[PDB]
Ligand binder design. Structure first.
Ligand SMILES: [Ca+2]
Length: 231
């Protein structure tokens, strides 16, 4: 029996497009009148951020604030602009201003309540992740929010999934994990017996579909999978 449904954050519940807009707005704020195209700065930021995602995946937790201050110090040195004071506060403000949910999220979370434990599993730090969910009005639609900061390790290390399952009070075989990252994200979930659902919104990850138990393009399909597993 499936008793718990856990969701990834960025790309699953939280819009990639809203995150990109919030990051562009951060770059615009950092640069001010400095004569660098903010879109160019953004692309270089995202490259370094991806190379940090890769380096820390599955590793012991390190605060995201520290990782992103390191990235931005490299960029300021490279391009000659002043390193921005209070960067974390700028980033929190912009993220809450321009962040968005995918359009089906509220419907989906509400459909599961009272039937399954509903959880989010994220690599983000606890306070910002929880504050963001509160700003978007859905914090109370979750039974659990489990973070790398709580577990001590980033996805796909099993410990973060182990903690989410302990909060729900069930073995992995009784849970689904839904996320958009085939690589460097769901591996620990399969270690523990969870059923993996790969969310591929644009049909762009076909070469990795064999890594997952089920593939969906819309979160409204998740409850149909869970019902079928339970029927
Ligand atoms: Ca993701």
């Amino acid at each position: 029996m499936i008793r718990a449904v856990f969701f990834d954050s960025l790309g699953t519940l939280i819009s990639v497009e809203g995150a990109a807009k919030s990051h562009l707005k951060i770059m615009e704020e950092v640069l001010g009148d400095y004569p660098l195209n903010p879109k160019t700065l953004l692309d270089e930021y995202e490259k370094l951020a991806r190379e940090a995602f890769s380096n820390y995946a599955g590793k012991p937790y390190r605060p995201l604030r520290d990782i992103l201050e390191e990235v931005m110090r490299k960029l300021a040195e490279k391009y000659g602009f002043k390193y921005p004071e209070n960067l974390w506060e700028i980033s929190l403000r912009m993220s809450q201003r321009y962040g968005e949910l995918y359009p089906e999220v509220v419907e989906v979370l509400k459909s599961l309540k009272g039937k399954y434990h509903v959880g989010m599993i994220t690599n983000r730090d606890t306070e910002p992740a929880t504050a963001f969910l509160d700003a978007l009005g859905i914090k109370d639609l979750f039974d659990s929010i489990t973070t790398s900061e709580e577990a001590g390790f980033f996805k796909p290390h099993p410990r973060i999934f182990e903690l989410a399952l302990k909060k729900a009070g069930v073995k992995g075989e009784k849970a689904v994990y839904v996320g958009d990252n085939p690589v460097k994200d769901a591996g620990g979930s399969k270690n523990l017996g969870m059923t993996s659902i790969l969310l591929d919104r644009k049909g762009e990850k076909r070469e990795f579909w064999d890594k997952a138990d089920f593939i969906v393009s819309d979160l409204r399909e998740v409850i149909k999978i869970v019902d079928e597993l339970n029927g």
